[PDB]
Write a protein that binds this DNA or RNA. Structure first.
Lengths: 91, 63, 102
RNA sequence: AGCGUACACGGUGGAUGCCCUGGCAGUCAGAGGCGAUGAAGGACGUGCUAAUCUGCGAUAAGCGUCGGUAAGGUGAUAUGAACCGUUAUAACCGGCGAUUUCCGAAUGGGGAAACCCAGUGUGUUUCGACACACUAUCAUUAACUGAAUCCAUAGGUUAAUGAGGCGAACCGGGGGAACUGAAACAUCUAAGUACCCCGAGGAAAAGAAAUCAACCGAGAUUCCCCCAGUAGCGGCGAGCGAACGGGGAGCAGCCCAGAGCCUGAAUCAGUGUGUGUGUUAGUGGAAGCGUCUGGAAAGGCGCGCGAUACAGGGUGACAGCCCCGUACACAAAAAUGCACAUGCUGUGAGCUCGAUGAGUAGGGCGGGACACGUGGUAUCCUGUCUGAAUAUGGGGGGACCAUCCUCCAAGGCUAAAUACUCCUGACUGACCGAUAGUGAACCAGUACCGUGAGGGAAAGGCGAAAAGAACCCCGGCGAGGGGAGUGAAAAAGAACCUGAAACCGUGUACGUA
């Protein structure tokens, strides 16, 4: 099972979002939400929206295993607009 | 329609066309401006009829 | 003279409707025809509470070219072509295969 | 750890590649112009409209009559509301007619382009207002009047012709640049080129010999070929560039010149009828079933049909047998160009004669200027006149008269082939593929620039079929994404023609202070 959440043509610089996301790679989703709650970076809001959308899509489609959900992949593509992409799965 | 009214004399045609223009055209435009008359077929019919009658009365008489 | 008009029995030659007969109700000016129960489509319409929304997916009919449908006659049971013949005071269409009159 | 090595995943893609509701260049025809009865082009309205192309003009996406067609249409963009009738008065196409706003040559006047202010006659009247026609322009023709001047003339009025400008080309003339070659350059080619005007034109001009020869000849004008890229010209350099002669399209020479004769004799333009051929809406016009893949067959296969029709186009990929069409056979209520036989007013047949174009040619006479200041030097008139013959005067030609012949004041006039397409109708392109092709394939002379004139771009390709991701969820009631569904296909998703690297991130395995 895999979950994908992406936002295209974000009104933010690609490098800023990349460096904000790099601070979150490898951290648990449950702890990632807490980390992003108090994060003051501008890209923090958009990455929080992306991850909440990802978990919502997983709940709509996936049956369970959200609690152990882990942030597997996170990246940003240059658009200067940016395209954020996040892949989350239990394994 | 195209030919039935042709044989009518000028006086009655003038009377009916002036009647239409003064009363029913005004009523129809007022109704349209008020938003009623959801069906516009009557508007087209009356406008075309008044156009026909006014176009006539010149070739029939005096020409 | 229009070879195809309202309420005409035809059979679709191609388009997943080979040999299935139908009755065209009208013909579009662009060369398309509308035959009920021949080509069903699943149109996804935008809901609107007013104007009697059909409700969700609409199982409607799509138009097909006249070329894909050939007129059918019960005289021989097979679709054929059509010609024009002069009657006493009018021109009328007639089938082929011994020239059945419509 | 951080790089390097490559692999996969993608995105920035944009090298390359296919097409077009588009251009460009040619071939054959009409037109080769319109209009005060108001040209084109603009301003403003006419749609159930928020807006547009086209149509139209307060009667306004339309009108009356006559034909073909007629069951879908009410033009579409681009859907929706609402309509009529469906075999003859829905509607569509065409022929002929009526309205046809304002400005605009723009015309009663004014005025600032879409603006304002009037008069006369005709009507009408609710005796307040409203509609119809006319009211710029100069001369000429005819008429009524007509001064200074008796008539006349000018002048006042009326009816008719002549132009109120635009538009691609050329005929002939007038003038009239720059640039370039000449190693730069005074002259010159340049170039009579850019440019403006004049008469009417679709063709025009010219169109019939004292025009050429050289002792013999073709004999109206124009275009083209050889002649010939030759002779010749040219600081004989660059470069320019013949003629004669012989052939293709064409090939009509008459007429007023005045008298008679016999004449309304063939011919010419105008003016009715009938026929044929086009325009002018259109009619008919052949042929496949099954099997298997294939998104869908027009694709592979079998057996059959017409072919005077296998030219072409559309139909989920390649169709003679699906359709539209082609060839072929037909058709016009009314208008309509072209040919004839054909009714009639006039010019108007043919023979004899000279007439042979008079103050005409030539001769001239002083000038200015013809670019020509006589330089190689010729042309206009004048200051003017003698002034021939009357095709009997000659006519110029290389042993004087050369032998020879001419052609000169008849013409006027005369059609043919011939330059070109602003625009229209039909056909073609081994011409191009959106920075090409037109500047403009897309609502392109469009955004925009520019007072105006004028200048002036970028932007094409979804899906055969929008049948356009119903629905649900998160999200901010947005944007965006995920499930589901349609769609063969969504590694076709409205940012939708195939789409490699360069460039940016993720994972994969190797070594890596």
């Amino acid at each position: 099972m895999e979950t994908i959440a992406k936002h295209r043509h974000a009104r933010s610089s690609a490098q800023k979002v990349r460096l904000v996301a790099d601070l979150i790679r490898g951290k648990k989703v449950s702890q990632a939400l807490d980390i992003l709650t108090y994060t003051n970076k501008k890209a923090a809001v958009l990455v929080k929206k992306v991850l909440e959308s990802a978990i919502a899509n997983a709940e709509h489609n996936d049956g369970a295993d959200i609690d152990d959900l882990k942030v597997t992949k996170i990246f940003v593509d240059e658009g200067r607009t940016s395209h954020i992409t996040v892949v989350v799965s239990d394994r | 329609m195209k030919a039935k009214e042709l044989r009518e004399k000028s006086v009655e045609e003038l009377n009916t066309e002036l009647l239409n223009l003064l009363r029913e055209q005004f009523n129809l435009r007022m109704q349209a401006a008020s938003g009623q008359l959801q069906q516009s077929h009557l508007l087209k019919q009356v406008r075309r009829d008044v156009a026909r009658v006014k176009t006539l009365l010149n070739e029939k008489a005096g020409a | 003279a229009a070879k195809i008009r309202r309420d005409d029995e035809v059979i679709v030659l191609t388009g997943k409707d080979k040999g299935k007969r139908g009755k065209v109700k009208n013909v579009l000016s662009s060369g398309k025809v509308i035959v009920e129960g021949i080509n069903l489509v699943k149109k996804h319409q935008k809901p609107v509470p007013a104007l009697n929304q059909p409700g969700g997916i609409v199982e409607k009919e799509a138009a097909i070219q006249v070329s894909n449908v050939a007129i059918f006659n019960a005289a021989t049971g097979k679709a054929d072509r059509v010609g024009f013949r002069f009657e006493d005071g009018k021109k009328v269409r007639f089938f082929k295969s011994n020239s059945e009159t419509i």
